[PDB]
């Protein structure tokens, strides 16, 4: 039930000049990814896997958005909660997929930058959709990040990243939590997005000077909530509330990452149909439990490297993401 997809990144400059031989092969049509475990294109053994969708190195941000993100966003507009995880070793594309980058030399405005990822495209589209038709709506974003089991708010511009938020159980709706003091920044229009994203970027920079390998060891949860009061061409009015969570997990390669360890153990119990699911054993799984066997539509995008040097890690990632497919929620 949970939809899982694989994105393989292309070789980098340094890999090209070294005559890199990709040990990975993608077949979008057949929804298959193949990896050369033994070695040698003349003769070799390989490992094969099937997923809901597969994307090779030739895949651009726009293909990713039109294919996975557009449909899930439409659901969010309908009043549903959706989450999308990015999983994989550091250097494979988790941040590139989730956030995106800027093209060199100020070649494009942020809303037309082909290298832009899911977050900016989504915030830009929400306004692109609801504005067109007749819909009164409010957009609020939030960026919660977990490092060594401590919560941080990377969007609040009146407190630095030394102040870790506190987390409690929500007495109202069970299996839900309350993060004290987390900031919800309202986005009044498309032309207010970039700066808010710039804000988080800069705080993210101070977090990195303060915490070791911060960009590799932390989990970021960027949430976008949409309050809608749609008024049909007739005169009806729908009050819908949709929430989309975009998670850039900490690098899966292998001190300890309690949330990462716990996430793996939660998937295990969900697919093994084990009664006790260890949600409470980490901050991430308590924050996102409804995304794991709950009433939320969730998608996992596992990013892999083509380089033969990451064969062992490419296998763990694929194997890890293939098991997730058996998870059922809603
Ligand atoms: N699909 C892709 N297309 C072009 N470049 C990519 C792609 N995926 C990753 N890269 C490049 O690979 C490097 C790894 O980036 P990053 O997204 O930060 O990895 P991660 O988040 O998995 O640690 C970056 O320099 C990035 O520009
Ligand atoms: C380069 C930059 O400052 N960006 N910063 C981003 C960002 C930072 C924090 C939280 C969420 C996002 Cl997503 C992403 C990105 C971006 C935004 C818009 C268009 C792009 O091409 C890249
Ligand atoms: Mg990264």
Swiss-Prot record:
Kinesin motor domain span: 1-327
Post-translational modification: A subset of this protein primarily localized at the spindle pole is phosphorylated by NEK6 during mitosis; phosphorylation is required for mitotic function.
N6-acetyllysine found at: 129
Gene: KIF11
Protein name: Kinesin-like protein KIF11
Annotated disorder: Microcephaly with or without chorioretinopathy, lymphedema, or impaired intellectual development: An autosomal dominant disorder that involves an overlapping but variable spectrum of central nervous system and ocular developmental anomalies. Microcephaly ranges from mild to severe and is often associated with mild to moderate developmental delay and a characteristic facial phenotype with upslanting palpebral fissures, broad nose with rounded tip, long philtrum with thin upper lip, prominent chin, and prominent ears.
Residue positions binding ATP: 88-95
Subcellular localization(s) per the UniProt record: Cytoplasm; Cytoplasm, Cytoskeleton, Spindle pole
Assembly behavior: Interacts with the thyroid hormone receptor in the presence of thyroid hormone. Component of a large chromatin remodeling complex, at least composed of MYSM1, PCAF, RBM10 and KIF11/TRIP5. Interacts (via C-terminus) with the kinase NEK6 in both interphase and mitosis. Interacts with RARRES1 and AGBL2. Interacts with TPX2.
Function according to Swiss-Prot or TrEMBL: Motor protein required for establishing a bipolar spindle and thus contributing to chromosome congression during mitosis. Required in non-mitotic cells for transport of secretory proteins from the Golgi complex to the cell surface.
Family: Belongs to the TRAFAC class myosin-kinesin ATPase superfamily. Kinesin family. BimC subfamily.
């Amino acid at each position: 039930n949970i939809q899982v997809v694989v994105r393989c990144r292309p070789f980098n400059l340094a890999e090209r000049k070294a005559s890199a031989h990709s040990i990975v092969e993608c077949d979008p049509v057949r929804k298959e990814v193949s990896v050369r475990t033994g070695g040698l294109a003349d003769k070799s053994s390989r490992k094969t896997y099937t997923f809901d969708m597969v994307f090779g190195a030739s895949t651009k941000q726009i293909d990713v958005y039109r294919s996975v993100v557009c449909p899930i966003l439409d659901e969010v507009i309908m009043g549903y909660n959706c989450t999308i995880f990015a999983y994989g070793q550091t250097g494979t594309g988790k941040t590139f997929t989730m956030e995106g980058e800027r093209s060199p030399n100020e070649e494009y405005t942020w809303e037309e930058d082909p290298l832009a990822g899911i977050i900016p495209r989504t915030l830009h589209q929400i306004f692109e959709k609801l504005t067109d038709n007749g819909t009164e709506f409010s957009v609020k974003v939030s960026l919660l990040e977990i490092y060594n089991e401590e919560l941080f708010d990377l969007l609040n511009p009146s407190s630095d990243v030394s102040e870790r938020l506190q987390m409690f159980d929500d007495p109202r709706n069970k299996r839900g939590v309350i993060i004290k003091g987390l900031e919800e920044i309202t986005v009044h229009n498309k032309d207010e997005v970039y700066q808010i994203l710039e804000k988080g970027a800069a705080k993210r920079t101070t977090a990195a000077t303060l915490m070791n390998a911060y960009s590799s060891r932390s989990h970021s949860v960027f949430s976008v909530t949409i309050h809608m009061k749609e008024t049909t061409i007739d005169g009806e009015e729908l009050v819908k509330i949709g929430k989309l969570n975009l998670v850039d997990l900490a690098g899966s390669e292998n001190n300890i990452n309690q949330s990462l360890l716990t996430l793996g153990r939660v998937i295990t119990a969900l697919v093994e149909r084990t009664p006790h699911v260890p949600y409470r054993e980490s901050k991430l799984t308590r924050i996102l439990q409804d995304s794991l066997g709950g009433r939320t539509r969730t998608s996992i995008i596992a990013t892999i490297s083509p380089a033969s040097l990451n064969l062992e890690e490419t296998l763990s990632t694929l194997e890890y993401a293939h098991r997730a497919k058996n998870i059922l929620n809603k």
